Amino acid sequence: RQDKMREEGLQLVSMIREGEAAGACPEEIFSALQYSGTEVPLQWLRSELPYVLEMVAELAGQQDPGLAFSCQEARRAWLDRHGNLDEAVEECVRTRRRKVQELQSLGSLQALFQHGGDVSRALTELQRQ
């Protein structure tokens, strides 16, 4: 008395195992719980998350234009920040700035958007005429 800590731990481990069995990584389950604590995070990912990633993308694009964001970049920032929307947007625009800076020649922007922030997929596709 009283280590309900172990109860909460077992609960999260349960949801993490269930997520892993459905292809969801623990960061997805935990990010779902931390951003509006849905009692089912598996339903929440498919159900409520798309508009939230769209939110990260809209705020991120509005913050430091022009450097549009892809859904994959917003998702990666969102998961990398365990669901913290402001941190997610900041890391999103920060990582995209890193990716346009990383390119050898361009500035171009369409290539990174079109290939979900993949530096070398946008690099290989933008080598065209």
Binding site: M5, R6, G9, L12, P26, E27, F30
Partner: protein
């Protein structure tokens, strides 16, 4: 000073035969614990997911942040299926 942390190892396959106790400083970071479990128990930190209470731990924070206070405080180490 050091405290007895009650790590319960959890895996994709698991029901409680394997428990572990680790002396850790609450002021030490979760990353430091990850390196400790790497050398001690042989688990690479890339596969380690620490759960303390209702939190999937971030390696930058201290165990006290979640938080490790008394001895015997329970933690869970979920290992990923590489």
């Amino acid at each position: 000073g050091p405290i007895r942390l009650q790590v319960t190892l959890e895996d994709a396959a698991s029901a409680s035969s394997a428990h572990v106790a680790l002396q850790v400083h609450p002021h030490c970071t979760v990353a430091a614990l990850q390196e400790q479990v790497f050398s001690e128990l042989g688990f690479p930190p890339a596969v380690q997911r620490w759960v303390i209470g209702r939190c999937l731990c971030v390696p930058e924070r201290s165990l006290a942040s979640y938080g490790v206070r008394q001895d015997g405080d329970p933690a869970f180490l979920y290992l990923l299926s590489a």
